[PDB]
Structures are given as structure tokens and as C-alpha cells.
Design a protein around this ligand. Sequence first.
Ligand SMILES: COc1cc(NC(=O)CCNC(=O)[C@@H]2CCCCN2S(=O)(=O)Cc2ccccc2)cc(OC)c1OC
Ligand SMILES: [Ca+2]
Length: 191
Amino acid sequence: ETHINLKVSDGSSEIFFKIKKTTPLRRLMEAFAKRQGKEMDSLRFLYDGIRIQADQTPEDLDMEDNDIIEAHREQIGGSTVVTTESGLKYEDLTEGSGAEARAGQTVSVHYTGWLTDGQKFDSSKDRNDPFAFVLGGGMVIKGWDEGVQGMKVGGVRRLTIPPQLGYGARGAGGVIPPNATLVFEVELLDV
Ligand SMILES: COc1cc(NC(=O)CCNC(=O)[C@@H]2CCCCN2S(=O)(=O)Cc2ccccc2)cc(OC)c1OC
Ligand SMILES: [Ca+2]
């Protein structure tokens, strides 16, 4: 009766908040922002398609248990998902600036990879260590050699990789199953 549970989805993962219906959503927004290393005014929180104001409360918005808040931490408002001739899907979430990565260059990125059920299988951020590779050199799965081309520093791009451009029927490490579609969020840090 007094409290409410809310899902916040940022496009890649979901986390839950229990909050009193009389607490301003500022506390939820600040709690979510702190996880991303950002201040809440630099994130866009939407409920039923409408931007949430910090001094609004869940009662003010007539929210109900297990409602969803959409959180956008990246820079582009209204992105588009591109499907290429290979079946690779990619979505630019932040454009970045400067030179564009091209084949033969060594690029350094941060990434997180998830299965489509939401299970994370690896993240360079969990080691606080960027990952580098020679773009186009066949040293990573094919979906990455294709999908990281054209990125600029600061750019954040979400890749959805069909298994034939990933680990295929083999899978990987007892963690990625056979024929898994792979989702990566990639931030280009240096080229
Ligand atoms: C076949 O099995 C494995 C392969 C690798 N590495 C590679 O193939 C190098 C190329 N990387 C890749 O193309 C991709 C894309 C670039 C970032 C790293 N990746 S990744 O999907 O996040 C690697 C990974 C797979 C499974 C679990 C955790 C991470 C690493 C493994 O253990 C860490 C592993 O499991 C024993
Ligand atoms: Ca490193």
C-alpha cells in the first residue's frame, strides 16, 4: 500500500526500485544515475512516453506496481536501427566526434555483451579495462569487424549479431550457447 516497485530499463538491462509512493522520483533518478556514473539531469527518464520531473512522485503520476520507466543515458534522441546486407543490426546511441574507425586501424573500446534473454556474458567494464583489436583483421567475431567500422570516439553503438556472424553453432566457453544471437553495447574510446 505505502510502497511501489518500478522497473527501469535503459535499453540493455533492467533494474528494480522499491520506493514509497510519497517519495519524489528524484531519489530513484539519482539512484539510477549513480550506477551509470552520471548526474540525473543528464539522463532522460520517460514514463508513458512523457519526461519525468524530479519533484514528481509516483502518486503524482498514478504509477502502479511493476510499471516501467524508460531511461536514456546516451546522446541521440530518437535513434534508428540499421539492418545491413549481412543481417547485422546496429543502432547508434551516441554519434561521437572526430575520425571514423576504418579497417586496419587498432581501435580501443569498452563493451558489454548479453544474450537475448538478458544474461550478461562479458564486459570490459567489469574489468575496468578497455579492449583493443585490429579492425577488419579477423581477430574478433565477424559481426564486430563489420559493426565497429565507421564508429567515432565517444560513439556508443549497440550491435545485434546473428550467430553466423558470432560463434555460430559452436558457441563459446560454455557460456554462449550454440546459435546465440549476441547483443553488444560498444563505446569507441580511441582510434
Ligand atoms: C571461444 O571461447 C572463447 C573465446 C574468447 N575470445 C575470442 O574468441 C576473441 C574474440 N572475441 C570476440 O570476437 C568478442 C567480441 C570482442 C570482445 C570480446 N569478444 S566476447 O564474445 O566478449 C569473448 C567472450 C566469449 C565468451 C565468454 C566471454 C567472453 C574468449 C573466451 O573467454 C573469455 C572464450 O571462452 C573460453
Ligand atoms: Ca586493455
